[PDB]
Amino acid sequence: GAMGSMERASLIQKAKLAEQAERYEDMAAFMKGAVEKGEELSNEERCLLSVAYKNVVGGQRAAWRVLSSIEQKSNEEGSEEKGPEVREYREKVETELQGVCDTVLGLLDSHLIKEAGDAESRVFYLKMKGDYYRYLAEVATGDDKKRIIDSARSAYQEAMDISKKEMPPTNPIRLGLALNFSVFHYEIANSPEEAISLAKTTFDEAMADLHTLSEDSYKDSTLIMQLLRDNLTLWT
Amino acid sequence: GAMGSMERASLIQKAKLAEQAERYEDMAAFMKGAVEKGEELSNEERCLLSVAYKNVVGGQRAAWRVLSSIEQKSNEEGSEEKGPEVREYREKVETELQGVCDTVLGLLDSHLIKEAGDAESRVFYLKMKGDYYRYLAEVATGDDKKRIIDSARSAYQEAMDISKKEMPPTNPIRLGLALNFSVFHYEIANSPEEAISLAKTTFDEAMADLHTLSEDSYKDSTLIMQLLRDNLTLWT
Amino acid sequence: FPATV
Amino acid sequence: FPATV
Ligand SMILES: Cc1ccc(OC(C)(C)C(=O)NCCS)cc1
Ligand SMILES: Cc1ccc(OC(C)(C)C(=O)NCCS)cc1
Ligand SMILES: [Mg+2]
Ligand SMILES: [Mg+2]
Ligand SMILES: [Mg+2]
Ligand SMILES: [Mg+2]
Ligand SMILES: [Mg+2]
Ligand SMILES: [Mg+2]
């Protein structure tokens, strides 16, 4: 690793600086170096890792969608043949996205998940595993497409099972997991009814538990609850 | 060059796709490959080259400013010592910025400028040369700082001399050159009076020539004239 | 696109 | 920052 010679604490400090500078590729490389030191991550450090890669892959996905749209239009009836360039460049972006997802999944498998015993860490990492398989699924077309979808489903389902046993229904990680597993059902698994049921049940069970929270916890939980409602509004 | 095996026209097509996808690093690498084919650039291709690198270096400069601000604060009286990390990461970003500027200046010197005979190409490239020396000047602190400032000044001045002889006062390239040379005077050369005089004279001489233009040319010229007025408002 | 976190 | 193009 090009980060092997840098102190763990200095990698963490630089990831925070890269975030303030909106340099998310650097942020991700610093956090990859920190993970590769081999020690478990704290709650704040897991946040830095997830923010960095979410921003990197989010930009890649937005670019891939622009390029896929152009490519689909070029394959319509009456379109002038522009040659292989649109497909090639969509493939270039796709391969770079797949590379980032494989990197994150590699960090989770070697060895973040196996050392994560507390619900707050284990659910967070298994949600991330479902998220990055989901991004692989968004671009998948080959023999392994169903297996990529099932890998996402399996990781999300293990996270859900732990979160229901070990976390209150307002826990922001539990809420965000349910938000994203619901989007998996709607966009990836062609299961809009399951997506809507999960978002609604998650919202209602959180609502009933808000009374237990402090003002600051209430703010955190209701922010994610509003994202569930936003999706329900989009889908109904 | 990693782009040596790709057709010039396919590099240009992919630069346009990268622009639509907001993938400006890719856009710049595609345009570097196109320049390295050795043929002169058309007006549209010069625009693609300048848009790509302006966006790449603009992001670098914004990150450098965030980091420099943090570093300056850490060097104030009463600040807790955070170690070398802020300086190191500011240096990392700075070195990457300098690398991009050297790449652009290299394309201009080998061999865009020497083959550019028409005013519209030669002024555009000499403005770019002044711009990228100016970005080097923004971060310069060493023995060569005055020489970097003078390189920017010299390129801008040659561009101004050609533009005054060969272009109408409303030409958008002439206007943009004057806009940026005025910013050079204000920010880099510590000459705010020269910056204000140049912006005002450029604005007034363009105003007097608007009557010669079509509606579309008028729209192009007045857009840049408004940037001159915006700067004058900021400075007065 | 729908919201995820 | 001031405007440039
Ligand atoms: C799984 C998950 C649950 C809640 C989150 O909360 C928001 C979106 C407010 C956030 O930006 N947190 C910092 C990054 S950990 C994020 C991720
Ligand atoms: C030297 C210069 C003069 C005018 C320009 O016009 C605007 C800013 C409207 C533009 O985006 N043009 C396309 C990129 S060439 C740009 C550069
Ligand atoms: Mg150590
Ligand atoms: Mg592929
Ligand atoms: Mg159920
Ligand atoms: Mg050829
Ligand atoms: Mg330096
Ligand atoms: Mg004068």
Tokens at A18, concatenated: 């890269």
Assess if residue B2 is contained within a domain. Answer: no
Contact call for A235 and C2, based on CB within 8 A: yes
* Distance between CA atoms of residues A156 and A88, nearest Å: 32
Which of B137, B172, B139, B122 is CA-nearest to residue D5?
A: B172
Instruction: List the domain range (segments joined by +) for residue B147.
Output: 8-235
Tokens (6 digits) for B170: 């409303």
Which residue's CA is the closest to the ligand 1 atom numbered 15? A47
Alpha-helical regions (H) of chain A: 8-20, 24-35, 43-74, 85-107, 119-139, 145-166, 172-183, 192-207, 215-235
Q: Write the DSSP string, A56-110.
A: HHHHHHHHHHHHHHHHHHHTSTTPPP--SHHHHHHHHHHHHHHHHHHHHHHHIII
Which of A180, A221, A235 best probes binding to C when mutated, by most C CB atoms within 10 angstroms?
A180
Contacts of B209 (CB under 8 A, 6+ apart): B168, B169, B170
- For residue B216 the two structure tokens come to 């579309």
Contacts of residue A67 in chain B, CB cutoff 8 Å? 17, 21
Top mutation candidate among B173, B174, B230 for ligand 2, by most atoms within 8 Å of CB = B173
Residue B108 in any domain: the answer is yes
Q: Which two tokens stand for residue A85?
A: 């360039």
CATH number, residue B200: 1.20.190.20
Angle in degrees, CA B92, B95, B96, rounded to 5 = 85
Please give the single-letter amino acid code of residue B45.
Answer: E
How far apart CA B173 and CA B170 sit, in angstroms, is 9
Is the residue at A131 inside a domain? yes
B165 within some domain: yes
State which residue of chain B sits closest to D5, comparing Cα positions.
B176
Distance spanning both ends of chain D, measured CA to CA? 12
Tell me, yes or no, whether B1 lies in a domain: no
> In angstroms, what is the span from residue A18 Cα to ligand 2's centroid?
30
For residues A142 and A174, the answer to whether their CB atoms sit within 8 Å is no
CB atoms near residue A208 (< 10 Å):
11
Crossing angle (nearest 10°) for helices A43-74 and A119-139: 10
Please, which residues have CB within 8 angstroms of residue A47's CB and are 6 or more apart in sequence? Answer: none
Q: Sign of torsion, CA B34 B39 B44 B46?
A: positive
Mark yes or no for CB contact C4/A179 under 8 Å: yes
Residue B194's CB is within 10 A of a number of other CB atoms, namely 15
Cβ pair B12, B45 in contact under 8 A: yes
- The three-state DSSP-derived secondary structure of chain B is CCCCCCCHHHHHHHHHHHHHCCCHHHHHHHHHHHHCCCCCCCHHHHHHHHHHHHHHHHHHHHHHHHHHHHHHHHCCCCCCCCCCHHHHHHHHHHHHHHHHHHHHHHHHHHHHCCCCCCHHHHHHHHHHHHHHHHHHHHHCCCCCHHHHHHHHHHHHHHHHHHHHHHCCCCCHHHHHHHHHHHHHHHHHCCCHHHHHHHHHHHHHHHHCCHHHCCHHHHHHHHHHHHHHHHHHHHHC
Name the residue type at position A33: G
Contact status, residue B196 vs residue B236, Cβ threshold 8 Å? yes
How was this entry determined?
X-ray
Domain assignment present for A225: yes
* Nearest Cα residue to B17 out of B42, B41, B52, B46: B52
B116-119: which pairs have CB atoms within 8 A and are 24 or more residues apart? B116/B40, B119/B162, B119/B163, B119/B165, B119/B166, B119/B167
Which of A176, A187, A234 has its CB closest to that of C5?
A: A176
Contact B116, B122 (CB under 8 A): yes
Name which of B65, B127, B179 to mutate to probe chain D: the one with the most chain D Cβ atoms within 10 A of its Cβ. Answer: B179
- How many domains does one find in chain A? 1
Asked if the structure places residue B3 within a domain, the reply is no
What the block records as the tokens of A12 is 């963490």
Resolution at which this structure was determined, Å: 1.5
Q: Is residue A3 part of a domain?
A: no
Nearest to B10 by CA among A67, A85, A87: A85
**DSSP class of A2:** T
Tokens read off for A153? 């489903």
